[PDB]
């Protein structure tokens, strides 16, 4: 009875597509024509961070816009100060194949993981002063792509084995597990309400999961290639995801459909990282063309170009207050643009 | 600047000195990548180098030079994502089971995909034709040959430039096919290194060292030419 289930799933998918298309009253471009354009937003590098021994892969800002955490592919977690340009801490990692880093909102723990399939969380407020391995948890059969903190007790981790779970720092066990996507998860993005979170995999689809209920609520399959970037809107109602086809798509959770498609003919490199500002008008996207591009959330026009890198822009992150943006590339340079 | 904001400068300088020392230690040692299908006998190659973790690291010493080989420990068939993390390495060794002809096409396709990588276009790929004795026995038994799997073998001759001539012609045809697949869109910035080996030979370390030396020499020449 496999054919019956297949045709039933196909009919359900067609019905969902028809119901989504019936709600498409108008496009976002036709509504945002009367608003004034953002204009050429020029940005300059105020601080230049140097000291990385390998390619910069991941970075993360804390609750304050002063401290920053960064990971390097040689097994080093660096704590940068955006104001004094001095290094605060240096955590040596046991496995140099790190692909992501996380910063707890309390400012006491920092997570890391990658190809070692082991998530290591280290405490920064150790009474002994030196960095000690706080929680080295394992259990996943795939490479870790992204890790985030919801509070001082739980941590969400993504793995390449198409299975995610919420780990508890107190016991080091999977509290809530999910069914998983149909492809390897690439990155994560937590909503401000700490209740839902959208996860993107290589199957050109993004699924909205719940923290308490281990199930998916919404699914978006509008992309055409592997989704390599994902970031939620500051209001928690929409999220933009970039693919390898040099296309970014903005999916709204309340609308459950695509709103805006950022793309360009002369742009052929895929999107690596996406981050939103405090207001959400400016969307910064890093491409493999050694440049970063700023787009308007409503006008879908280019607002500025960033050519202060000599390699692929690996990651970019905007502070909580929108004062500056930290961009790290494979050239071991972590530049802080205004 | 306060007193405290000076102490921070001294701590930053100490951290920078520690990072410089760690960079020196990391640069004194060389790093290599190991790739291969499940049918290939890479485990024997790792075991003979006596001179839930998805990554296996093997450290050894050849000619007073430290080599750290990194191999996939436990992962799925996905290869398009984690291949970008193993770039900028000294060399990549691709193990292929030249005995079985079924997996030979898959190995050739994997080698063509890895060589034509957009990010790994500056890293050379070393090829080790493992299991030569098994291939020789299979081609001398007369049960299965390359004719049933590749038609071009019917129009290939031994080049002019104690082993049976059939095995020699077969391995030369395999090497020629590998060279023709590798040189396709190579741009001359990186070249391949094929070598015949088995699971009992001990001179593999010398060949790996010579290949790494040639790669470093080519890198120095490219640096001097400002390409």
């Amino acid at each position: 009875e496999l054919d019956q289930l297949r045709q039933e799933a196909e009919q359900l998918k067609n019905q969902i597509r028809d119901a989504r298309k019936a709600c498409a009253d108008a496009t976002l471009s036709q509504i945002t024509n009367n608003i004034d354009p953002v204009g050429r937003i020029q940005m300059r590098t105020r601080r230049t961070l140097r000291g990385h021994l390998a390619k910069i892969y991941a970075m993360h800002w804390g609750t304050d816009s002063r401290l920053l955490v960064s990971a390097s592919q040689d097994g080093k977690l660096i704590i940068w100060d955006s104001y004094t340009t001095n290094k605060v801490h240096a955590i040596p990692l046991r496995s140099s194949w790190v692909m992501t880093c996380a910063y707890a909102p309390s400012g006491n723990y920092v997570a890391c993981g990658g190809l070692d399939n082991i998530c290591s969380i280290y405490n920064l407020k150790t009474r002994e002063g030196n960095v000690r391995v706080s929680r080295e948890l394992a259990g996943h059969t795939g490479y870790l792509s992204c890790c985030r903190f919801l509070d001082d007790n739980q941590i969400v981790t993504s793995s390449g084995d198409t299975t995610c779970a919420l780990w508890d720092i107190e016991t080091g066990q999977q509290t809530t597990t999910f069914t998983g996507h149909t492809g390897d998860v690439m990155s994560l993005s937590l909503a401000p309400d700490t209740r839902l979170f959208v996860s993107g995999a290589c199957d050109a689809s993004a699924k909205l999961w719940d923290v308490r209920e281990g199930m998916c609520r919404q699914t978006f399959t509008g992309h055409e290639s592997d989704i390599n970037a994902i970031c939620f809107f500051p209001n928690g109602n929409a999220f933009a995801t970039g693919s390898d086809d040099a296309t970014c798509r903005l999916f709204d959770l309340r609308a459950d459909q695509e709103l805006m498609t950022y793309s360009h003919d002369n742009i052929i490199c895929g999107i690596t990282s996406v981050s939103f500002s405090k207001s959400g008008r400016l969307l910064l996207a890093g491409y493999d063309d050694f440049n970063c591009n700023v787009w308007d959330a409503l006008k879908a026009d280019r607002a500025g170009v960033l050519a202060g890198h000599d390699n692929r822009v690996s990651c970019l992150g905007v502070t909580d207050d929108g004062m500056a943006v930290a961009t790290g590339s494979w050239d071991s340079f972590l530049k802080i643009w205004n | 600047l306060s007193a405290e904001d000076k102490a921070a400068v001294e701590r930053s300088k100490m951290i920078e000195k520690q990072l410089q020392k760690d960079k020196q230690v990391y640069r004194r040692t060389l790093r290599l990548l190991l790739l291969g299908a499940d049918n290939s006998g890479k485990s024997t190659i790792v075991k003979q180098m006596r001179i839930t973790s998805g990554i296996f690291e093997t450290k050894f010493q050849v000619d007073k030079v430290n080599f750290h080989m990194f191999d996939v420990g436990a992962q799925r068939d996905e290869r398009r994502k984690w291949i970008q993390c193993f770039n900028d390495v000294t060399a990549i060794i691709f193990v292929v089971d030249s005995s079985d002809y079924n997996r030979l096409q898959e190995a050739l396709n994997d080698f063509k995909s890895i060589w034509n990588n957009r990010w790994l276009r500056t890293i050379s790929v070393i090829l080790f034709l493992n299991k030569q004795d098994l291939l020789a026995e299979k081609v001398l038994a007369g049960k299965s040959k390359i004719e049933d799997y590749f038609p071009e073998f019917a129009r290939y001759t031994t080049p002019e430039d104690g082993e049976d001539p059939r095995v020699t012609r077969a391995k030369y045809f395999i090497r020629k096919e590998f060279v023709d697949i590798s040189t396709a869109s190579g741009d001359g910035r990186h070249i391949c290194y094929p070598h015949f080996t088995c699971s009992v030979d001990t001179e593999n370390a010398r060949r790996i060292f010579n290949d790494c030396k040639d790669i470093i020499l080519q890198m120095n020449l490219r640096e001097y030419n400002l390409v």
Partner: nanobody
Amino acid sequence: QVQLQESGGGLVQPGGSLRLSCAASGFTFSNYKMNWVRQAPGKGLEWVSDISQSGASISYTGSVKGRFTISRDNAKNTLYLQMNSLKPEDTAVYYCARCPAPFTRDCFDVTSTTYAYRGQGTQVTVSS
């Protein structure tokens, strides 16, 4: 939505002809490299042939080299495969997939078990 539907197949007598079609919708068909692979009963995924975007570089495997002919039409976004002189060893499920990265030369995860960029595949058997 990326969708690939394969048609044709069935029971074909040895020495006949077959015309397999692959319709791709939901993306730009002229910007991705197409691949036809096969999976035999009790075996793994085996690559058969590949064709580039503009149809310039077309490659086949040594097992069926010279017998099959793959082509593509960008006006209707279709992939055609003409198979002649079928053998009893051709009884397998054929899959029509594409490479994930556009405007490139490399094509990773062609015969991977978990690949969401392939169709259902058509079963082609040859027996009498």
